Amino acid sequence: DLDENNFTTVPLVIDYVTPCALCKKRSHKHPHQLSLENGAIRIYKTGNPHSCKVKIVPLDGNKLFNIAQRILDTNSVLLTERGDHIV
Amino acid sequence: WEPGFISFEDAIKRVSKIFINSIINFNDLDENNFTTVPLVIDYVTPCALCKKRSHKHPHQLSLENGAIRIYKTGNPHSCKVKIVPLDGNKLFNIAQRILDTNSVLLTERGDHIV
């Protein structure tokens, strides 16, 4: 059911065949929901999550590869016919 | 404020990452108000400051001895304190000092004369 749009509204349903890894209980009184802020996809329970813990997964795809791409696209390093880079 | 610590933007991104939660007046942060403005948290999840639904008081971040310190106003009993440092690769600041003395050069023949 999950799509790109349904991000911070739809609940995520979990059939706790085993105890929840978030809070080590037999099951949850309410499903979990996902949020996006400052480059993190936070995990939390819906309702009163005092006996719950927020988990975050960061979305940063190799910061150094992004910088490499930016420096490259600025067109300041070139590979010449002789094998020498010129900057 | 010293030009050796970090840019302001990196500091605010670090603190916003450490709240694990949003800030209503995040875009309202300016250069004039650094520690004088308490921070409102859109408590849309359980807190990470003390694993509570919401704090009845705001959180104030303070600067001392080259570090921003964050804590809760009022009753810091069911809470804790987090300290974040500001030192922008002290080795780079050292290396930039050494060039200020003008005591190492580069020569057309290709080697540095110290």
Side-chain angles (χ1 to χ4, degrees), chain A residues 1-8 10-11 13-35 37-50 52-87, chain B residues 1-27 29-32 34-36 38-41 43-63 65-77 79-114:
Chain A
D1 169 44
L2 57 89
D3 303 334
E4 171 66 281
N5 51 293
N6 49 3
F7 212 79
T8 60
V10 56
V13 297
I14 285 288
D15 48 351
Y16 301 79
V17 172
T18 60
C20 182
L22 270 288
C23 59
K24 299 288 95 176
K25 314 189 306 210
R26 76 184 80 181
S27 177
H28 262 270
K29 72 192 287 185
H30 275 70
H32 286 89
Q33 190 182 3
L34 311 181
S35 63
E37 72 276 14
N38 49 74
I41 297 317
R42 170 182 41 186
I43 303 298
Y44 64 86
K45 195 262 283 178
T46 57
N48 46 2
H50 289 118
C52 305
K53 63 174 174 61
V54 293
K55 291 273 291 295
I56 54 173
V57 287
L59 298 195
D60 210 3
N62 204 13
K63 198 173 188 73
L64 302 174
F65 191 89
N66 294 345
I67 302 175
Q69 191 76 256
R70 208 151 289 96
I71 307 297
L72 191 78
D73 286 332
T74 43
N75 264 335
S76 289
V77 179
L78 269 66
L79 175 50
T80 47
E81 196 186 5
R82 311 184 76 190
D84 278 328
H85 299 77
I86 77 176
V87 300
Chain B
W1 184 82
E2 295 297 328
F5 290 118
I6 306 173
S7 56
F8 173 61
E9 288 78 343
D10 205 352
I12 65 175
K13 299 295 187 291
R14 276 192 217 249
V15 70
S16 295
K17 283 188 50 54
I18 207 68
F19 287 169
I20 205 169
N21 202 6
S22 172
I23 296 170
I24 307 299
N25 46 3
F26 177 65
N27 281 26
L29 293 174
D30 319 311
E31 189 269 330
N32 293 318
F34 278 137
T35 66
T36 66
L39 275 75
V40 61
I41 305 173
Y43 270 128
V44 297
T45 52
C47 204
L49 279 296
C50 56
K51 275 74 189 163
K52 157 171 71 159
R53 47 175 88 188
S54 171
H55 281 86
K56 56 187 300 213
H57 296 95
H59 274 78
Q60 192 175 3
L61 74 166
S62 80
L63 178 85
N65 67 272
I68 288 290
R69 175 183 46 177
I70 59 179
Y71 62 110
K72 181 216 173 176
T73 315
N75 276 306
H77 205 145
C79 274
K80 61 186 181 293
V81 66
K82 296 92 165 153
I83 182 66
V84 68
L86 324 176
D87 215 4
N89 198 233
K90 61 176 74 175
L91 303 179
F92 190 82
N93 311 109
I94 289 171
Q96 166 63 231
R97 299 282 165 86
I98 291 178
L99 275 72
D100 296 330
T101 71
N102 219 8
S103 284
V104 59
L105 298 188
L106 183 75
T107 45
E108 309 80 15
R109 315 181 68 80
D111 45 6
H112 315 76
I113 60 170
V114 65

